[PDB]
Structure 1
Amino acid sequence: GMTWRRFDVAYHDPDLDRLILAARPLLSESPGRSWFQRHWVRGPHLELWFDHPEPSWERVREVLGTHLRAHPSRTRIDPDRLLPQHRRLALAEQIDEPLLPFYDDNTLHRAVPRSRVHVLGSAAAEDLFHDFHAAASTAAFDQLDAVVAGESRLGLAFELMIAAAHAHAEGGITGGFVSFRSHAEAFLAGAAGLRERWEAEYRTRAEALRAQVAAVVTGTPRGRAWTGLLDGFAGRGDELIASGALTVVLRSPSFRRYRLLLNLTALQMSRLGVTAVQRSLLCHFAASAVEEEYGVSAIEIAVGG
């Protein structure tokens, strides 16, 4: 917190995948824990977090300098309409920090790490997330090779969601149902007319989605890699929800674990460039595919008595 460095790479092109990829050597060079995330404070930007002195500002400035100059971002923005969205997002995410001015495109800034303690629960909670972000930043680089190499971004994300529910939900995949239906019903309560669209988008892909669910449930290299990564944080997470040092079958200790590991997965989806809408769509896709593939209703009714 007095050790963490943060660098903000201002970039208004929503596609960051190639920029992120350029920055990979920096994190490999870093002897400590390093990580990155997409963020919006003072406009779209990439954030590079390092808890050790190396690489170093001038290293960072030269690596990202090359790329930024070679591959600039031509995208404009609307500061006038964007500011209100952020001022709301600041209240939502609970973000005290200069929202103004906006960074100019294609600029490297040095910046102070923000604290997430008042949001996460403890200092211990904050450390756990740093650890996860570090591990998941590594795994993000691989997943983004694939994506730039043409692969489905949304398809990779769905895979992580399904794998996580199967490994870590009480009762495997059918036990992640409610959490999927939850995330998605939340979004649709906030915009009625999308319900029907979400339904039509599932319907044309129904058997295709189910086939992916089944495939991930059986086991895939990517699926086992992700759940493995999450493994590392399950034990430590338990303690912190047990001890009360981490954000609140409400009281259920093994429902709390899962909700956390599902949030970590969601953060991975941000990192990979899956927006709130796409994330809402995947959750709907997941809830419906799981329903139809396993007759989750038949089951809920069955265990009714």
Structure 2
Amino acid sequence: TWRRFDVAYHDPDLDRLILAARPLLSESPGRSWFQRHWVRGPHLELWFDHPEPSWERVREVLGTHLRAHPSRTRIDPDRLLPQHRRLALAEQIDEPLLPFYDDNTLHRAVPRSRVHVLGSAAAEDLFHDFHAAASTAAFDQLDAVVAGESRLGLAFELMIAAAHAHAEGGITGGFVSFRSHAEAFLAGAAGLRERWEAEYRTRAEALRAQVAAVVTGTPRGRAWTGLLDGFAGRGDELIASGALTVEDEVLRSPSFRRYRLLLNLTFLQMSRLGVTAVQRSLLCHFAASAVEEEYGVSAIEI
């Protein structure tokens, strides 16, 4: 059985709060993990499958940080609530959306089940295992961000690495998925796409250099794909047995479905690092464009 603690913190910059929580997720046996979530307003979630750290210990560590570094961002519930209602339906969340937590407060919360979305208890357990491993990796990534490294740059690296290692044909195969995701998000937004294209142009040479670096191989890339490798076999088995619901003519291949899962896990990591849905889709646009330009390929030609 899981324990879920919500830390209400309305400033979108959660990095230092997350780093303050690192000991709680690093000091005791058991699976522990964190994610950013929107229910009842922006908050950090800490998940533990073992009894330590206790509430007292959680309160000790986080109370100290909140006193020294309180969030000072006012939110607008009446503006957010329409968006939350859409998210609740799309994400199949049945929890109360109101009232929003007061800023800088700690709460016990309901350990939600995702079996209805993931397909089975086995699939849910796989995701827990992923979040535990990836939360540890996220601490180091967020350290880097706090120290001045680009959040989006770090996320881009993870995505390129995942595609190069885990997509049929490497980066020049996997990039098609990036274009697909970007267009799915845009949903016909010619104006937004134009902004994406314009920003891509300004960043093109740097993004292309980043793609080449990651294809050459970077420490962070190798570490990420190493983490993903640990889940690929289990993913394959659960996809095959129908225990994990993942829902051309290359859709039949377990190879593609594995890729899609591991890319999805990468997106979840990006969320942990504070990259929003719109930013993740922007990065997919950039990734598709950079790959096309660097390797002289076309998503539409395939």
TM-score (norm 1): 0.96
1:260 aligns with 2:258: no
Q: Distance in 2 between matches of 1:97 and 1:43?
A: 12
% identical aligned pairs: 100
Indicate if the aligned counterparts of 2:179 and 2:299 stay in contact, CA closer than 8 A: no
Q: Distance in 1 between matches of 2:143 and 2:22?
A: 11
**Cα deviations by residue, 1:154-180 (Å, 9 ceiling, x for unpaired):** 100000000000000010001111110
After TM superposition, give the deviation of residue 251 of structure 1 in Å: 2.4
Segments of structure 1 that go 5 or more residues without pairing to the other structure are none
Indicate if the aligned counterparts of 1:38 and 1:47 stay in contact, CA closer than 8 A: yes
Give SS of 2:299's match.
helix
Q: Distance in 1 between matches of 2:98 and 2:203?
A: 43
Indicate if the aligned counterparts of 2:178 and 2:287 stay in contact, CA closer than 8 A: yes
After TM superposition, give the deviation of residue 297 of structure 1 in Å: 2.7
Moved more, 108-117 or 241-250: 241-250
Output aligned runs, 1:32-43, within 5 Å.
32-43=30-41
After TM superposition, give the deviation of residue 298 of structure 1 in Å: 9.5
**Cα deviations by residue, 1:18-50 (Å, 9 ceiling, x for unpaired):** 000000000112310000000000000000000
Q: 1:299 to 1:16 in 2, by over 3 A?
A: closer
Give SS of 1:296's match.
coil
Q: Distance in 2 between matches of 1:193 and 1:299?
A: 21
Indicate if the aligned counterparts of 1:136 and 1:268 stay in contact, CA closer than 8 A: yes
Indicate if the aligned counterparts of 1:30 and 1:50 stay in contact, CA closer than 8 A: no
Indicate if the aligned counterparts of 1:13 and 1:75 stay in contact, CA closer than 8 A: yes
Spell out structure 1 runs of 4+ moving beyond 2 A: 248-251, 297-301
After TM superposition, give the deviation of residue 300 of structure 1 in Å: 4.6
After TM superposition, give the deviation of residue 73 of structure 1 in Å: 0.5
Give SS of 1:209's match.
helix
Q: Distance in 1 between matches of 2:76 and 2:135?
A: 30
Indicate if the aligned counterparts of 2:9 and 2:71 stay in contact, CA closer than 8 A: yes
After TM superposition, give the deviation of residue 299 of structure 1 in Å: 10
Q: Distance in 1 between matches of 2:166 and 2:224?
A: 11
Indicate if the aligned counterparts of 1:170 and 1:254 stay in contact, CA closer than 8 A: yes
Indicate if the aligned counterparts of 1:183 and 1:283 stay in contact, CA closer than 8 A: yes
Give SS of 1:37's match.
strand
After TM superposition, give the deviation of residue 192 of structure 1 in Å: 2.8
After TM superposition, give the deviation of residue 250 of structure 1 in Å: 2.4
Q: 1:169 to 1:105 in 2, by over 3 A?
A: same
Indicate if the aligned counterparts of 2:162 and 2:263 stay in contact, CA closer than 8 A: yes
Give SS of 1:55's match.
coil
Indicate if the aligned counterparts of 2:175 and 2:299 stay in contact, CA closer than 8 A: no
Paired position in structure 2 for 1:251: 252
Q: 1:134 to 1:196 in 2, by over 3 A?
A: same
Paired position in structure 2 for 1:132: 130
Give SS of 1:53's match.
coil
Indicate if the aligned counterparts of 1:10 and 1:46 stay in contact, CA closer than 8 A: yes
Indicate if the aligned counterparts of 1:6 and 1:49 stay in contact, CA closer than 8 A: yes
Q: Distance in 2 between matches of 1:93 and 1:292?
A: 35
Output aligned runs, 1:10-159, within 5 Å.
10-159=8-157
Q: Distance in 2 between matches of 1:12 and 1:191?
A: 29
After TM superposition, give the deviation of residue 193 of structure 1 in Å: 1.1
Q: Distance in 1 between matches of 2:210 and 2:50?
A: 41
Question: RMSD value over aligned CA atoms?
Answer: 1.2
Q: 1:104 to 1:300 in 2, by over 3 A?
A: same
Give SS of 1:35's match.
strand
Indicate if the aligned counterparts of 1:198 and 1:281 stay in contact, CA closer than 8 A: yes
Segments of structure 2 that go 5 or more residues without pairing to the other structure are none
Indicate if the aligned counterparts of 2:151 and 2:273 stay in contact, CA closer than 8 A: yes
After TM superposition, give the deviation of residue 114 of structure 1 in Å: 0.4
After TM superposition, give the deviation of residue 246 of structure 1 in Å: 0.8
- How many pairs were matched up? 299
After TM superposition, give the deviation of residue 278 of structure 1 in Å: 1.3
Q: Distance in 2 between matches of 1:291 and 1:225?
A: 25
Q: Distance in 2 between matches of 1:169 and 1:271?
A: 23
Q: 1:186 to 1:206 in 2, by over 3 A?
A: same
Q: Distance in 2 between matches of 1:42 and 1:55?
A: 24
**Cα deviations by residue, 1:235-279 (Å, 9 ceiling, x for unpaired):** 000000010111132222110000000000000000000111211
